């Protein structure tokens, strides 16, 4: 969750030179980003998720 | 395939998929000063990986009628974090460098760059018997630009591409450690300079060690419809840096 | 080079020259049911190479504003010769599958596909508390099409690409066995599914085993003058198929 | 020759996806077909060819 | 990679970077005449590397509606220096040949060439019962050109591409040593002919040994904007040449 004692940093991406294309090739393209964990990743304290929401029983 | 190259220094990493071959120096790899050639007596500061890492300079835009660019590297790395600070608190310094120049295009583009590291590139003035200002030689991380015709700005460098500022034929600059960025087949302008000076350690501000130059011989040229904006990014990492003679904050 | 791959099954052969890497399953290769995990008692019919061969489904056209396609494979292979007939005369069946999805373009095209095999993809209805017709789930060899906005056809699947029909985030579908057909570098959407169910043999018509989905994340986009018609062809071969419980002709 | 007892089959070719080209590249191209025999091919009965035709002597 | 090939003969060198595979003959490499199969009695002249070297013929321009070209090689090499002179002073001669046909384009071009070496290509006349002039068969280093429709020039070769001059189906010419110059992937029309005749040495002027033919099956075709002028250059080198029976200057 969000607390100020364990802030974690920032991820930014910057144009290093440019995109250079020849003629009759579309300029505007798309980068896709993935995410995963390494082989030293670990979690500790069971709590309930803040996304599950129920108002009445599902019938 | 040998077109792929990964370079890891400190906490930074550059990967290239269309490299050709990494050049290293005059045959010499950078290394710390031995105690049989040393002159100063107190304990040097080999800091950490805190300075031996890649720093990104500003990008220049390569147009159809651009002529050339140059930098001054013990002065160009003056505000890049702890390298700049260890420059500003020490009297002597000593470092090799790994320069990686990027530029990319598509297969429908054409044009060729020359990337040289010129030691002791003593520049000439525009009007002859007149002083040169320090801002016209080295502008920090900002590139100074050659011209095609002779220039006559007051207190400025004579900047013609057919003489490269120093007063030689520009086709003879392939005697220094160099490569070519041919947009047909390159992105690997990698040059591992060792430390080249006539004293074992030297001052960083008072002396400029070398000068990177990017001179396009076969100009950038493309058909209508391709991307007209082609940037060039220069990334530089000091190697085996060490410092000596600590005193108060220097000359900015 | 490892960009070339040949796949031979039965009397059919698929050759690719711009493959990347064949994926095989959850680590498991398809194999016949052992007699230590078997439940039925009579002798199974492992037919021949007469069913373990490639069958070509229909082609869909990938336009600039297309959204996605899906199939239902124990039901989609219901009229492909002896696989369809052995489906129609037997009560139980069991098979792995080798799915090979083709799509090609030129080097001037751009766009990216996602090819997932989703086990037990229980689809959701468009209007909420309403039955789903069998034709809207599985249309034989004909692909059903997602939409961009939410749909409200009666007795139809809720077909939005940002929920993939099941009700999850579509960027989380990379947990199933998958590849990408990047038109820059791929044609090899090959996925060797083993048999995944909670009973050792199952009925072919009453139960759908999995669902192929082709979802373009980075859309097809090209400059004017290139070929605008880009088809996508899905080829599928059952593997290690066997049948049990022979009776009269089934439910068409 | 042609008789109904030894019919031999058919060779067909089908578009699997399409031809996809970039801009300023010609769409309409050409496929060339070859034919040969394997290392188990065999022929048996000498007869004359049905293509040789002569009316008078060549002089 | 095996796409690179260097061929060194005498004092000439041909390098190709997009070769596919060098063909050599009917399995036989060219070699000098042994003294168990020889007929003439005096000492032959194996000259030097002075004749075993590459000679460049003239270039033909390959247009959209071009049909074909041919040459006659013991007669086509009649003015190429010392090969031509040793042809003109000797009665007998004998040589193999290494033919290297060049043609290049870009990746946006399409078209396919057929390069055959046809031994004893006895040409047919245009009007039937009429003599053929020597200039219409062999024009030195200058290529003669087939047509699409049948031709009726007096004292000329019947020059239709669908019969190749000799009177056979042109799709059957792949029985001779051949390659294809596919502009997608080739430049290597290299064919190492051995000496093929029914006498151990033969006259150079009176007998034509073989005939090179360049027939485009899939025609040259390109989009608007590409380079429309695509030349084809034929380079030929004699190999293992020797001469016998010296007398005065021959028939020009």
CB C223 within 8 A of CB A25: yes
The rounded distance, in Å, linking the Cα atoms of A8 and A6 is 6
Pick A24's closest partner by Cβ from C174, C217, C225: C225
Judging contacts by C-beta atoms under 8 Å, the chain C residues touching residue A24 are 108, 223-226
Pick A24's closest partner by Cβ from C217, C221, C223: C223
CB C241 within 8 A of CB C93: yes
User: DSSP letter at B167?
Assistant: T
Contact E110 D24 (CB under 8 A): no
Which CATH number goes with the domain that contains C248?
2.60.120.20
Tokens of residue C226, six digits = 């290139």
Best of B15, B55, B105 to mutate (most A CBs within 10 Å, chain A):
B105
What resolution does the deposited structure have, in angstroms?
A: 3.6
Q: Note the Cα D31 to chain centre separation in Å.
A: 14
**Cβ of residue A27 closer than 8 Å to a chain D Cβ:** no
Cα angle: D45, vertex D46, D47; to 5 degrees: 115
The rounded distance, in Å, linking the Cα atoms of C95 and C44 is 13
Strand order in the sheet with C231-246: C55-61, C231-246, C90-103, C189-193
How many beta carbons lie within 10 A of that of residue C78, not counting itself?
20
Residue C188 burial by Cβ neighbours in a 10 Å radius (0-12, 13-18, 19+): buried
The rounded distance, in Å, linking the Cα atoms of E70 and E140 is 11
CB B214 within 8 A of CB B103: no
Q: Which domain holds residue C120?
A: 1-252
How many beta carbons lie within 10 A of that of residue C80, not counting itself?
20
Please tell me the distance in Å from E86's CA to the nearest CA on chain D.
Answer: 41
Strand order in the sheet with E55-61: E55-61, E231-246, E90-103, E189-193
Judging contacts by C-beta atoms under 8 Å, the chain E residues touching residue D24 are 108, 223-226
- DSSP states of chain E: -TT-EEEEETTEEEEESS----B-TTSPPP-PPPTTS----SPPB---TTTSS-EEEEEEE--TT---EEEEHHHHTSSSTHHHHHHHHEEEEEEEEEEEEEE---TT-B-EEEEEEEET--PPBSSSSS---HHHH-BTTBPEE-BSS----TT-B--BTTTTTTTS-GGGGGGSSEEEEETTT---EEEEE----SSSSB-TTT---EEEEEEESS--B--TTS----EEEEEEEEEEEEEEEE-S----
Judging contacts by C-beta atoms under 8 Å, the chain D residues touching residue E221 are 26, 28
Please tell me the distance in Å from A44's CA to the nearest CA on chain B.
Answer: 28
Judging contacts by C-beta atoms under 8 Å, the chain D residues touching residue C12 are none
Judging contacts by C-beta atoms under 8 Å, the chain D residues touching residue E225 are 24
The answer to whether the Cα torsion of E145, E146, E151, E157 is positive or negative is: positive
The rounded distance, in Å, linking the Cα atoms of B236 and B99 is 4
Nearest 10 degrees: Cα torsion B216, B221, B225, B230 = 0
Pick C221's closest partner by Cβ from A24, A26, A32: A26
Q: Note the Cα C131 to chain centre separation in Å.
A: 24
CA distances from A32 to C176, C182, C217 (A): 18, 12, 9
Instruction: Spell out a b/e string for C108-128, using b for 16 or more CB atoms within 10 Å of the CB, else e.
Output: bbbbbbbbbbbeebebebbee
In the three-class reduction of DSSP (H, G, I as helix; E, B as strand; rest coil), residue C84 is classed as: helix
- Provide the chain D residues 30-59 that lie in CB contact (below 8 A) with chain C: none
The rounded distance, in Å, linking the Cα atoms of E207 and E203 is 6
The rounded distance, in Å, linking the Cα atoms of B25 and B32 is 16
**Cβ of residue D37 closer than 8 Å to a chain A Cβ:** no
Contact A17 B227 (CB under 8 A): no
Q: Which residue of A has its CA nearest to D24?
A: A24
What is the total count of domains within chain E? Answer: 1
**Cβ of residue A45 closer than 8 Å to a chain D Cβ:** no
Q: Identify any residues that bridge with B244 across adjacent strands, giving them in sequence order.
A: B92
Please tell me the distance in Å from D5's CA to the nearest CA on chain E.
Answer: 30
| H helical segments located in C102-199 | 134-137
Q: Which chains touch D (3 or more CB pairs under 8 A)?
A: A, C, E
Instruction: Spell out a b/e string for B44-74, using b for 16 or more CB atoms within 10 Å of the CB, else e.
Output: bbeeeeebbbbbbbebbebeeebbbbbbbbb
Q: Identify any residues that bridge with C45 across adjacent strands, giving them in sequence order.
A: C243
């Amino acid at each position: 969750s969000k607390d100020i004692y364990t802030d974690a940093g920032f991820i930014t991406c910057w144009y290093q030179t440019s995109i250079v294309v020849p003629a009759e090739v579309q300029n505007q393209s798309v980068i896709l980003c993935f995410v995963s964990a390494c082989n030293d990743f670990s979690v500790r304290l069971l709590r309930d998720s803040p996304f599950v929401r129920q108002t009445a029983f599902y019938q | 395939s040998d077109r792929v190259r990964s370079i890891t220094l400190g906490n930074s990493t550059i990967t290239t998929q269309e490299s050709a071959n990494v050049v290293v120096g005059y045959g010499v790899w950078p290394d710390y000063l031995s105690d049989e050639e040393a002159t100063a007596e107190d304990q040097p500061t080999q800091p950490d990986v805190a300075t031996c890492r890649f720093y990104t300079l500003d990008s220049v835009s390569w147009m159809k009628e651009s002529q050339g660019w140059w930098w001054k590297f013990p002065d160009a790395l003056r505000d890049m974090g702890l390298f700049g600070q260890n420059m500003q608190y020490h009297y002597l310094g000593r470092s090799g460098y790994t320069i990686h120049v990027q530029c990319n295009a598509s297969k429908f583009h054409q044009g060729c760059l020359l990337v040289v590291c010129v030691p002791e590139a003593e520049m000439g003035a525009a009007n002859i018997n007149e002083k040169i200002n320090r801002e016209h030689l080295s502008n920090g991380e900002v590139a100074n630009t050659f011209s095609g015709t002779k220039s006559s700005n007051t207190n400025d460098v004579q900047q013609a591409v057919f003489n490269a500022g120093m007063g030689v034929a520009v086709g003879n600059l392939t005697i220094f450690p160099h490569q070519w960025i041919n947009l047909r087949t390159n992105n690997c302008a990698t040059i591992v300079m060792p430390y080249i000076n006539s004293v074992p350690m030297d001052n960083m501000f008072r002396h400029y060690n070398f000068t990177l130059m990017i001179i396009p011989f076969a100009k950038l040229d493309y058909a209508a419809g391709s991307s007209t904006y082609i940037p060039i990014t220069v990334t530089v990492a000091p190697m085996c840096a060490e410092y000596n003679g600590l005193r108060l904050a220097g000359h900015q």
